Design a protein. Structure first.
Lengths: 316, 131, 316, 316, 131, 131, 131
DNA sequence: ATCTGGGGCGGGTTTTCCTCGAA
């Protein structure tokens, strides 16, 4: 697996939205329980949903996959990730619906040979013989650092006008600025591997032939999310992002690093990783760290310079 | 005395609403979950009332409803409104903010009263124009 | 794709307002999350909207397009940019509305021939068959540099009078000074190319013929923003702009340089450019640097003298 | 589009004021972001309003217009530049209100003939059908140059007592002295040209006839600001002045000279004009200079000795 | 006069229900256990009626049922309804709120009447469409 | 003691406002986001009060409201105002500036109190002129 | 120690102002934008204080405010004033000039303190004469 | 340090979709 935590610093953006009321746009906000010096409080804070990141990652994956020659579906050729869920998608793509449970593996392999996205991003088909394939990448909402007593965030509204020569044309847009942090998970040991239980069916040899390329492309795709390329309303409200701190870990066993809330989550997560290996008897456990805010790190750990070097080393 | 303070705050909110023709400050007050939101509305509504005072569009008066009652006359967009009662004192604002620091419920109570005052006055003014 | 970051210095300025309270005109301000030795702070600072620069860019584009013989719309002939939002604009321009989804492409091409602005700036038509076209240039607010422990910006009010001989006339105007910065993006590999999916329709040959002229005009248009010709209230509050540092980059793959917050942002983007090319398998990456404040630059990158040279180089 | 910049030297002056406190008249002061050898600092410095120069220029324009056959409005015949904003001025001058947008153009032409000032300086009318006309002259504040690490400006209070034989008379006035600079602009390609768009109406022929005369008057007007005649409180505080450097340029495309912040700012603007004549297709670019301080100039620049020569040449 | 006030409040609730096609405000009114819940519904229903007035979808009229009776025409989703009677005055709202401060029973009485008015009108409108 | 300091600063701001007939210094004080803005207003208001003292238009007095209370008489444009309370000491200004260096909230609190004092006095003065 | 130096400079400015009956030197000090203006005022105020010392119209004393505090008695135009505190030493002037060479802000701080001392003393002296 | 002025007006959002299946 590859698991990581990242800390961002965004100013004057409006990335995710929700239904509008009147002539005012709405920025997604959620409740959070925070620990203070006097107890526990409930606050409301802006949040960027977890599916915008998924869409950005899958779009980057589609681009790179088409570039490097891996099979890509028809509907997913355009960026319409309905995937092979509804009968219309199957009819357009040209696949017969499964008959009984015994046909599930055939259907899964046939779908997985036609669309990299349906492989490295999971999919679901609902019908007489339901078929599932859980995602190989996992993401969650992007919350600001719940540190101390003062949440470092702020949300305001702005006034805009559409000028005209024959008045007979006014709107308000929400804008935010926060210190965002989020965590991500991936597992390369399950790509190009049918999930359903059955008997080997022809074509899996080709699946085994392309496994290295598929894994390489999936690892490359993360650079989009890590570099700050996602969210809507980017035409006129291009944000000003910057990377403060990042921890990434490659292992052989389940492992989740500390959230990026507290000031010191690097030293704590490295110390935890040092012992988790012995606890669960693994064989590989490596940690990479990027530090721009000068927080406590530790000793005897990698210190990269950018995200490109991190992606290169993960590829190697 | 708590009810009298809440009633005087409700009169201030109703005067500000009738003068500005905007419910936005009363909506913010009745939905407040913090002392920050309440205090911001108490400033902004008094700032609106201050402009009406400087323009002589908001004035204190007495009205016979056979004893004289204190009232506030409000002129807005050629409409004339009269709110019966006193505006809050500085001490009423301070005591009300202390009540809010204990329980934000009192902002909802004042907002509900303010909207009731404004609705009754707007209904009466529309009926007289139709007659 | 041409991306860039720019650092301007502005004194005794008011290029945007929001509303007025009493007899006072309000400048636009917004929150920002800032980092200092102690920690994270929230500050209110004057900003210039992102729709006060798109308008200037589109106006310069209209002027140049008219001067060079390219087509220009009817409403957009005057500096009104409703484009084709509502049915009235279509009726005045003289186009028919889309019938169903299948015909959508047709309509777009027509709209994309009459008016150049509707091509490089994108548009949206809302009807029984909605049509969309995202912009080809992206912009964001103009914030001052969040560097160090002291934001170098100031805001104040000024008192003004209107003379008269029969008194029976006083106004307050906000004025700001700042070290502004921002960034911009333009993708010339999609200009004069339909963005809707469908079968070929007649008239695309003219688009193919005019592609070169359209791209050249669009590239030339940026000189407006880069020179410093934008904003409102310029008649009596003409500002005093000055260019300090500028970095622009032409590539074949998605890429964004560092914001202009830190003194050392020229070096980091140049260093990251080559590694990004290597990881993403690019085939072209060039960078141009204009420097007058005397900060670290790097090596193996061109050094120009004036903005006018950069436009020529980009056109070449 | 006659543009240019100018530098002035003054001593012991008070050419503007703001709300006074007590018995001490307050000279206007504003904040500025300054660059030094160490970083960007904030300073407070005396300045002179931009509207005062506009008023002085308009007054001189009226004075020279009444000296010839050009018309002048009743209200503006006396120096009260209210133009036609309020309805009282309309009633006094005897012009019907604009009925609807279809009539709007008419109104403008009718207003544009009676008063030359309302034409050259633009105006505004607010009502059911608002009408606008942007000014054909633009100006900004008069700041001291930010050259070097030291601002060459000083301010200081003064003391004055009124004699009296029966005491029962003391006042203080601020005085400043600084090396001032400022840039101006005037676009002669639109004088006497209606701005509102619509069907032509009677009287435009008369407008066309006098276009040359109006342009000549507007060009002549600038001698008022170039010489130095402007500002209040000159009856006792008469400030010594001595021109130091000037640059004036005539073109056919948008262009703005370099602010007078450097010992060598003529060379940069000359080079930029030479390089920009080609970037935007143009057919005219002329520059002039009046140098009296021995700064770097360059070559191929017409040199004069008095502002009268510059005015005559521009008229030619 | 108490019954006339309750009847005019019931007409307001019935007009708001027929225009909004939602029983939620009448449900809240008939289940109210406090003056807060009653007053909130009285505002929200009048706010719905205000939108219908501004859209000209709610209007006062007279109808011959052989004398002319006051009525309110309501247009909603292409359906036309007519409620017979007057809407409450500002004084009726104030006197009704005083009745509620004594006994919240009057909110249940007004809610029961409002639902009866709305049900009879909806039944008649469905029958005419079936014929 | 913090509330007493804030109250004395509010009295200074109210005296300066009533004497100058300008809200500008109170507006600057209540909108302050830095110690610079607060300190500048504290100087400018005291400079206005100093002119009123030198002209004998601002004077300390006692008033019976049956015990004597400290007050400040202000004469402006032929209007007479009386602010009840003390003006701040040099120590109150210094302790208030230390409170501002910890939290600029105290400037907003003092501004809100000052505007309340001034509004109540202006309302009472206009009512007596109308009678 | 920086605050003690500023306080002693403020006492010198207040003594010079009360003795000369002129604010001009304090105005020049608080508006200074250069070390030249500050140094010129520091000389001119000490030259005024030197004349008051030679005339025995300025003298150091102790006053019980129940411990003895250092003070400066000033006699001017038949008025008696007492400033509580020490005058600056030669080292305080030198250290203050070094503070001004770093930041002219300290001249504004000393000027604000000096005017506060003088205003409080002038107010107290006028009140005792009225009683 | 004595006065007098303390803002006016047009605009205050349009569309597309409102859950699929196995138990």
């Amino acid at each position: 697996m590859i698991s990581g935590s990242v800390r961002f610093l965004v100013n004057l953006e409006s990335l995710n939205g929700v239904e509008s009321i009147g002539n005012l746009t709405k920025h997604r906000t959620a409740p959070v329980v925070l620990k203070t010096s006097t107890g526990y409080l409930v606050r409301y804070v802006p949040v960027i949903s977890g599916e915008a990141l998924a869409h950005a990652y899958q779009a980057s994956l589609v681009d790179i996959a088409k570039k490097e020659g891996l099979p890509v579906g028809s509907l997913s050729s355009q960026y319409e990730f309905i995937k092979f869920s509804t009968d219309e998608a199957l009819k357009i793509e040209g696949i017969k619906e499964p008959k009984d449970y015994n046909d599930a593996r055939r259907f899964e392999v046939e779908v997985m040979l036609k669309d990299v996205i349906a492989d490295v991003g999971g999919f679901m088909y609902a019908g007489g013989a339901p078929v599932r394939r859980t995602s190989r990448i996992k993401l969650g909402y992007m919350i600001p650092a719940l540190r101390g007593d003062e949440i470092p965030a702020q949300l305001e509204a702005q006034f805009h006008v559409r000028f005209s020569n024959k008045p007979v044309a006014i709107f308000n847009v929400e804008v935010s600025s926060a210190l965002y942090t989020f965590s991500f998970e991936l597992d390369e040991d399950l790509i190009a591997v049918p999930s359903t239980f059955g008997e080997k069916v022809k074509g899996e040899e080709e699946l085994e032939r392309q496994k290295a390329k598929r894994v390489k492309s999936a690892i490359k795709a993360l650079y989009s999310l890590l570099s700050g390329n996602f969210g809507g309303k980017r035409s006129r409200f291009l944000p000003s992002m910057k990377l403060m701190s990042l921890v990434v870990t490659k292992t052989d066993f389940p492992f989740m690093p500390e959230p990026a809330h507290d000031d010191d989550y690097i030293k704590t997560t490295i110390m935890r990783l040092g012992k988790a290996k012995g606890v669960l008897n693994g064989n590989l456990a490596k940690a990479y760290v990027i530090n721009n805010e000068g927080i406590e790190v530790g000793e005897g750990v990698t210190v990269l310079s950018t995200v490109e070097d991190l992606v290169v080393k993960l590829e190697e | 005395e708590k009810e009298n303070i809440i009633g005087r705050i409700a009169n201030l909110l109703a005067v500000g609403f009738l003068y500005s023709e905007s419910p936005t400050l009363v909506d913010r007050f009745a939905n407040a979950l913090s002392k920050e939101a309440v205090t911001k509305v108490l400033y902004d509504v008094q700032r609106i009332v201050q402009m009406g005072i400087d323009r002589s569009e908001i004035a204190t008066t007495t009205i016979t409803i056979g004893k004289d009652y204190p009232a506030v006359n409000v002129n807005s967009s050629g409409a004339k409104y009269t709110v019966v009662g006193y505006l809050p004192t500085s001490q009423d604002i301070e005591d009300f903010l202390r009540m809010i620091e204990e329980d934000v419920y009192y902002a909802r109570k004042a907002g509900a009263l303010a909207m009731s005052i404004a609705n009754r006055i707007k209904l009466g003014s529309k009926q007289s124009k139709s007659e």
